[PDB]
Homo-oligomer: A and B are copies of this chain.
Amino acid sequence: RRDWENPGVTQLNRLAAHPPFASWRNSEEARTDRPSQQLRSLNGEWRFAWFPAPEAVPESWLECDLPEADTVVVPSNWQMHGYDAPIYTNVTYPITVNPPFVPTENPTGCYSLTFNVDESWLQEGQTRIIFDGVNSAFHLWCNGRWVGYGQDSRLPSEFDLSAFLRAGENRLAVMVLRWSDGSYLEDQDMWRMSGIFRDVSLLHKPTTQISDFHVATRFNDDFSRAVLEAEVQMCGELRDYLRVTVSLWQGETQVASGTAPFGGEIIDERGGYADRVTLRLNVENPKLWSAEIPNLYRAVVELHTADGTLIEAEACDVGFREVRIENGLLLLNGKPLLIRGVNRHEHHPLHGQVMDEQTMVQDILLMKQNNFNAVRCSHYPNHPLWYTLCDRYGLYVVDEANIETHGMVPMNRLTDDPRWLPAMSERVTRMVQRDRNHPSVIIWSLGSESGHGANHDALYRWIKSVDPSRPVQYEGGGADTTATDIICPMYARVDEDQPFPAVPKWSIKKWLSLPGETRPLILCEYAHAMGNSLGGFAKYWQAFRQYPRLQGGFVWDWVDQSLIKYDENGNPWSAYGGDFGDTPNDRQFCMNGLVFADRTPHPALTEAKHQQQFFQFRLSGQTIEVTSEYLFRHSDNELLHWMVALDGKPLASGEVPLDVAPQGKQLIELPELPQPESAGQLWLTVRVVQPNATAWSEAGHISAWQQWRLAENLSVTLPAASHAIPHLTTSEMDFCIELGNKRWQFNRQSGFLSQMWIGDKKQLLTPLRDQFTRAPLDNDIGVSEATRIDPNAWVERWKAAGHYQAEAALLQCTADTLADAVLITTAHAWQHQGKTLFISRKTYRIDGSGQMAITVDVEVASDTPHPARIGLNCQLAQVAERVNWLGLGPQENYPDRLTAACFDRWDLPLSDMYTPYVFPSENGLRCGTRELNYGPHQWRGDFQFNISRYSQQQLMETSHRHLLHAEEGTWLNIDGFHMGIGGDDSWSPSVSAEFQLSAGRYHYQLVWCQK
């Protein structure tokens, strides 16, 4: 039998799924959640050997260790050890699409372990092995005898080894297949790896044992009273003396306790469950669980004899909370949620898909620090710890079954085929049976992108019947199917409709009100954070606040799926699809995270942080209105910090504690703000600071901010009359202009300021030329490749219109000497196949104060694709250490993604002004900048800018960041205007109309001086 090619065999001899066990033999240990002696990790050094196909594995391996086998760490994905290559493919299956068959050349991982088992574990009781995660299927032998088989690589498979083990030394033999019929259900957009990638362990249970237990919590109208219901099930031999006690603890305080013999109520004509019992406990004024206040209790289930002797104990953390949909809204404890969510794949750049405690806590912290309150287990049940941490730290979780069949044509071919229903069910049911007691799980999910099929309907109903405590959602087949309690579209836009046939992505605001639609709307995936992205993120968040039934979404996604490679020297770099010899692959589509693989923030994160703020602000004259968006908590660790600064110079600053009830308001009266004499804009900057450390943040953590423009004094005083007069040197080739030790040279054949001197020293390495293009962002490229041209992507419009080729033709270059200045007038025209794309009409005025006032007027042909930018560039000779600007920052910000940035005096090292996206693109821009300082140079105006050691051309032509080489000098881009960055998705043009450069006639002015 080839069980891995039969979706009717998903397992053999596998034990039933159940919630987490430890079989404690001391209730105190159970209560306090201390380690259990009855639970042993088999983690550590294992013996591993790779084979090209299961047929190639020697018979001898069952009986004894292979001399050819290495010693490796388990858990691990074996492609992280180098045995074969990890494949990165998005939609297209990494195997031939031929259900239920897999390739005969099926990489086979042979794991074995020689290990000791103590005598006492075999004299009495049941000993089982637990494989938390095996990708994708496996057979298992113990001491040569065959035990069982298993599938579903994201949930634990367990087997009873009691009869196979002997005292002292034993040997496990685990045969792991990379591909199986199960693979067809596991087509998530991630890396395709394999092996024993999650813990292994041994659990000793008594013969008479707790086999299962459910926790439930119901509430009266106001949540001032609750009933905790505990259904307990047992295996073994029923006795009249057997008892079950459930006790509920809060810290060291016994809150409630109940005891009953086995014997459930009559459920039908044949009686009831004699191997079950349900405990009901009253709890008065329970402390309720939420992401805001993750209040927990502890439940201990003790299986014991009448006379008091404990047989075994099981426990779990209990969070008192109700989740329900009512009148179109998702309520947690009767209050309508706003899901500041993010999707999170299980990813590590060194270990692969192997999860460890440290990184999880690192993710959770970082998330909570950036105003996230919900996470989605895209697209499978996670490592069991993850649920415990979300219980404890406080994040709402969507627990998703490990079913995705994206590559099927059409998408539901399997999920509408009744022969696949059993394999699908076990992926849903065994998740539910596992995670149902974790309070952080508030929503169940039937999987990812498998369209909509009868099987989804069956299974949706199955959960509703089995666990009505939680809503079920599912996006497949149009996001609003009969299989979903929630309209959960992916990448639906705020205002724009996208009526795809059969499965349209409506504007979220419009989707709500479609005839007869009543359900809430929470995007399961939105704001595609690929490279320089998250543009127009603020639009979603405005909509979420105005629309009750729009209750948030989950950003895609948390972390770049970039793996670590090494060069010749041993130096490490970040690799994406293709970099392992994987083909077909999908390049950098695996990197879509708000953070880098190492958990460094992308610039987008701060934008998320700002939009997801729990405090809203309004300004009326000098009254600040602080509005809380918390549902349950009082603002008991929050003070408001305000300052008013004139073009960067702090005038008045202040501090007021916040005392805002949830959903409440607080008015703060700013003291008389003493009006300054000199010219400039006044700015108000409030920030919310948390005086005290919490479990998820340090003291002084900033949780929210906002700015307002106050009064403005416009400059009316004339610059001190220029004592001197600049000198023209008309040549046939050059216009040279001299003042003191400053010299400006204009080339007459090209028309651009070609060189500049301070003393004898050259300032420029390439002349000051107009620029109309940028190094395309992942959003500009979309799905376009060299051999898969999508002519609709912004980049492909630009290429075909000649934007990148077009050379400037000079139309007019004249010079005039004035009363106190030298006036240069230029005009240019960029043409391609005799089509004129742009016209640039400039006037340089160099007065006797040594200042050069540039005036640029650009015409853009209405019938050409709107350009990335309208600006000037040049390569500076100088390489300085610090960049100092007055404008939006400190971080990278773009016109459609600058809400998080503040206007101030910013001073950063040069390296900070470059964002190291793994796929290089235009990056580092700062907008609404009025003053830029670089060494001797200053530029004044109202422009956008970036500043780095890399040319747009280098950026364009280099595929990976690590191959970029610092160029001689400093490249400077100064844009009067720059195009939005898009991001609603990364496969079709996503820059909103208001952020495209379509005016046709643009104007910007610059004052370039050396102060």
Residues of A bordering B, CB below 8 Å: 1, 6-12, 16-20, 85-93, 97, 99, 132-133, 151-156, 265-274, 381-384, 402, 406-414, 418-423, 425-427, 429-431, 433-437, 449, 451-452, 454-455, 457-462, 464-466, 476-478, 482, 500-503, 561, 563, 576-578, 580-582, 584-587, 589-590
Contact = CB atoms under 8 A, between A and B. Distances in A.
B8 A585 contact: no
Given A88-B589, A268-B452, A268-B503, 16 more contacts: A8-B8, A87-B580, A88-B576, A88-B586, A89-B577, A153-B402, A154-B381, A155-B430, A268-B411, A268-B502, A269-B503, A270-B406, A270-B411, A273-B413, A418-B425, A421-B429
Chain A contact residues: over half helix, strand or loop, or mixed?
loop
Top 7 nearest A-B pairs (CB, nearest first) are: A88-B577, A422-B422, A461-B461, A418-B429, A457-B465, A93-B407, A85-B580
Given A20-B384, A132-B383, A414-B99, A586 B89 contact: yes
B270 A589 contact: no
Nearest to A464: B457
A95 to B, nearest CB: 9
Contacts of A89: 577, 582, 584-586
Nearest to A581: B85
Which of A8, A153, A477 counts the most B-chain CB atoms under 10 A from its CB?
A8
B585 A88 contact: yes
Given A12-B8, A578-B88, A267 B433 contact: no
A586 B90 contact: yes
A267 B425 contact: no
Given A89-B585, A155-B434, A270-B410, A482 B503 contact: no
A582 B457 contact: no
Given A8-B9, A410-B272, A425 B427 contact: no
Given A154-B402, A433-B418, A482 B465 contact: yes
Contact of A457 (B8, B87, B461): B461
Nearest to A576: B88
A22 to B, nearest CB: 12
Contacts of A502: 265-268
B582 A88 contact: yes
Kindly name the residue among A88, A273, A419, A576 whose own CB sees the greatest number of chain B CB atoms within 10 A. Answer: A88
Nearest to A435: B19
B451 A462 contact: no
B462 A454 contact: yes
A274 B409 contact: yes
Given A402-B153, A502-B267, A437 B19 contact: yes
Contacts of A266: 410, 501-502
Contacts of A274: 409
A585 to B, nearest CB: 5
Given A90-B586, A434-B17, A584-B89, A152 B268 contact: no
A422 B10 contact: yes
Contacts of A382: 154
B7 A9 contact: no
A80 to B, nearest CB: 8
A231 to B, nearest CB: 12
A430 B152 contact: yes
B270 A451 contact: yes
Nearest to A579: B88
Given A7-B420, A8-B11, A457-B461, A88 B436 contact: no
7 contacts: A7-B422, A92-B584, A153-B402, A268-B452, A268-B503, A418-B429, A460-B461
Contacts of A437: 19
Given A266-B501, A457-B461, A458-B465, A8 B408 contact: no
Given A19-B434, A155-B381, A590 B268 contact: no
A16 B459 contact: no
Contacts of A381: 154-155
**Residue of A12, A155, A449, A457 with highest tally of chain B CB at under 10 A:** A155
A433 B271 contact: no
Nearest to A95: B407
Most buried by B among A451, A455, A582: A582
Contacts of A478: 268
A454 B466 contact: yes
A591 to B, nearest CB: 10
A411 to B, nearest CB: 4
Contacts of A270: 406, 408-411, 451
Nearest to A585: B88
Given A152-B427, A422-B10, A406 B584 contact: no
A268 B451 contact: yes
B451 A563 contact: no
Given A425-B418, A586-B88, A462 B457 contact: yes
Given A91-B406, A437-B19, A590-B88, A465 B454 contact: yes
Contacts of A384: 20, 132, 156
Nearest to A93: B407
Contacts of A452: 268
Name the residue in A99, A268, A406, A461 with the highest tally of chain B Cβ atoms < 10 Å from its Cβ: A268
Contacts of A589: 88, 90
Contacts of A88: 561, 576-578, 580, 582, 585-587, 589-590
B407 A97 contact: yes
A432 to B, nearest CB: 9
A267 B408 contact: no
B436 A19 contact: yes
Q: Which of A409, A501, A561 has the most CB of B within 10 A?
A: A409
B7 A8 contact: no
Nearest to A481: B465
Nearest to A382: B154
B465 A409 contact: no
Contacts of A586: 88-91
B461 A410 contact: no
B420 A10 contact: no
B410 A17 contact: no
Given A19-B435, A460-B461, A482-B465, A410 B155 contact: no
Contacts of A19: 433-437
Contacts of A413: 273
Contacts of A91: 406-407, 586
A467 to B, nearest CB: 10
B458 A585 contact: no
Contacts of A155: 381, 402, 427, 430-431, 434
Contacts of A577: 88-89
Nearest to A406: B91
A8 B419 contact: yes
A152 B269 contact: no
Nearest to A483: B465
B466 A462 contact: no
Contacts of A93: 407
Contacts of A420: 7
Contacts of A419: 7-8, 16
Nearest to A588: B88
Contact of A18 (B7, B273, B433): B433
B267 A410 contact: yes
A150 to B, nearest CB: 10
A401 to B, nearest CB: 9
Contact of A92 (B407, B503, B578, B581): B407
